[PDB]
Enzyme design. Structure first.
Site: not given
Ligand code: 0LI
Ligand code: CL
Ligand code: CL
Ligand code: CL
Ligand code: CL
Length: 305
Positions: A29-31, A184, A166, A33-37, A170-171
């Site tokens: 779904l997205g990538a 994120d 961020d 340099a170091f990680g991917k979904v 896009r997020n």
């Molecule tokens: C597999 C996966 C893993 C993790 C996360 C993710 O967003 N993690 C996350 C990490 C941190 C924070 C908050 N911090 C921000 C930084 N900050 C310094 C500290 C607090 C939040 C937040 F939501 F709270 F914001 C989220 C999303 C996915 C996805 C997906 C997905 C599902 N459908 C689709 C369709 C297309 C593409 N992708 N996709």
């Protein structure tokens, strides 16, 4: 990287643990340099033996120890936050027997920025002709609902003493029913080749979304996220345009932000939504509204419309 909370002291609840072998990886779904979904199917997630589609975040063989810490720290943050309506929902994780895997819900409509650009040309401000409802055109009502949901999600993050850092279209993930989920992508975004991230020092940062105190003093607070939310509103009501269009991030850009230059209202922004943008962009963080106040403001706008 954590203004207030300490993820190292935050436990990873082992109720989240999910068997590695029960995941079947699919398309990427997205990538970065170091990680991917990756999209995936999990076998035993639901109580009855019926499979369900999920998204999984994982590191690439290119990742170093810094990224392995960041992914585990991200899992602790997601577990600490818990499930919420306006946030992407953690479903499980795999922490032993291999690399860290972070399992969330799958959002069918992808990220909001691409959605706005995909829907931009058929946008309808006023009511949809009742025959045209099958077209699912983007409307002003949808844009107001998006601003409302993201503001509520950020209000919840602030109540957990968490800074996003961020916040941008896009997020933001989008599900069925025009429901938004803050997310994120982090390491699963190729910031190296993304023109919305700008070289500054030894980091690559989303400067056009960043508050001045974050730019010049590397300070991240509840109110610096509010600034980013104001830029997000501009994204939303310009139907996915890049902020400060035609202005590259250079020495003149930093002076103009410092000296009080702000963007004009986008073509489709209601005057009261633009009023919010201006208050979000106040040079004084204390004069900026809180996310909770933004929710109350937008809620009154939706009622009166
Ligand atoms: C597999 C996966 C893993 C993790 C996360 C993710 O967003 N993690 C996350 C990490 C941190 C924070 C908050 N911090 C921000 C930084 N900050 C310094 C500290 C607090 C939040 C937040 F939501 F709270 F914001 C989220 C999303 C996915 C996805 C997906 C997905 C599902 N459908 C689709 C369709 C297309 C593409 N992708 N996709
Ligand atoms: Cl790992
Ligand atoms: Cl945080
Ligand atoms: Cl939808
Ligand atoms: Cl004005």
């Amino acid at each position: 990287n954590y203004s207030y909370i300490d993820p190292t002291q935050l436990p990873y609840d082992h109720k989240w643990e999910f068997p590695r072998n029960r995941l079947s990886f699919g398309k990427t779904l997205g990538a970065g340099a170091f990680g991917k979904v990756v999209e995936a199917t999990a076998q035993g997630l639901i109580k009855s033996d019926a499979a369900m589609t999920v998204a999984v975040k994982m590191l690439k063989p290119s990742a170093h120890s810094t990224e392995r810490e960041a992914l585990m720290s991200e899992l602790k943050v997601l577990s600490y936050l818990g499930n919420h309506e306006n946030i992407v929902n953690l479903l499980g994780a795999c922490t032993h027997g291999g690399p860290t895997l972070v399992i969330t819900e799958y959002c069918c409509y992808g990220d909001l920025l691409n959605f706005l650009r995909r829907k931009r040309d058929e946008f309808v401000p006023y009511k949809v002709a009742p025959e045209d409802l099958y077209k699912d055109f983007l409307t002003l009502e949808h844009l107001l609902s998006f601003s409302y949901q993201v503001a509520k999600g950020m209000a919840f993050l602030a109540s957990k003493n968490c800074i996003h850092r961020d916040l941008a279209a896009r997020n933001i993930l989008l599900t069925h029913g025009n429901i938004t989920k803050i997310c994120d992508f982090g390491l699963a975004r190729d910031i190296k080749n993304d023109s919305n991230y700008v070289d500054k020092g030894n980091a690559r940062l989303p400067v056009k979304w960043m508050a001045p105190e974050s730019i010049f003093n590397s300070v991240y607070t509840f109110e610096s996220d509010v600034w980013s939310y104001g830029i997000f509103l501009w994204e939303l009501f310009s139907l996915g345009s890049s902020p400060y269009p035609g202005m590259p991030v250079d020495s003149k850009f930093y002076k103009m932000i410092k000296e009080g230059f702000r963007m004009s209202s986008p073509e489709y922004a209601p005057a009261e939504m633009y009023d919010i943008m201006k208050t979000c962009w106040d040079a004084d963080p204390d004069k900026r509204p809180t996310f909770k106040q933004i929710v109350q403001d937008i809620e009154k706008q939706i009622s009166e419309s």
